[PDB]
Amino acid sequence: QANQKRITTPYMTKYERARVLGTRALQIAMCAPVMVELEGETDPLLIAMKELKARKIPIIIRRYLPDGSYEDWGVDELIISD
Amino acid sequence: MIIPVRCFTCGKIVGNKWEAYLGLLQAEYTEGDALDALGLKRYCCRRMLLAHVDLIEKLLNYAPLEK
């Protein structure tokens, strides 16, 4: 769907928060370039948490509607719960 | 099996008191008189001999493995 027609919630649900964090910290573990300057922490999960808090994760979420359509929500663009 | 060397609670030596306790019971002494004739003032030490069953005697009735 186009950017005008977005009917899903602007809040990043707990499942999206869990899976985005997991799949981004996995990328950090495979030596993907970090999007946020770190202060010496070495754990990819904490690195991914910091990126999520700073809203810099280079990932977008495809929300499949029941009819078959989908919406592309950028992680930076929707509200994080915590 | 055999009398423990020390009382579990107190730690006072009880291992040497069993034969003397049986000897005192082989007299007019009751258990309550034998225990404090042996010097057991605390019931923790008293139960060590009062409730002990001496199964080593039943174990010795069997012939040994060797000779």
């Binding site: 950090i28 573990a29 495979m30 030596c31 070495t42 990819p44 | -």
Partner: protein, 51 residues
């Protein structure tokens, strides 16, 4: 629907008030048998080499 799984342990539970609700105490025998796969990165390369 249900099946046996690797990386699983089982033993007797016992109370311990001196750790938070999110913590669980596991024996060194269980922890020294079950493993977690860490991917090497220049951040943890020295620690993993020492390990």
């Amino acid at each position: 629907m249900g099946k046996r799984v690797d990386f699983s342990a089982r033993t007797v539970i016992t109370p311990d008030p001196n750790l938070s609700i999110d913590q669980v105490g596991v024996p060194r025998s269980i922890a020294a048998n079950m493993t977690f796969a860490e991917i090497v990165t220049p951040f943890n390369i020295d620690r993993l080499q020492e390990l």
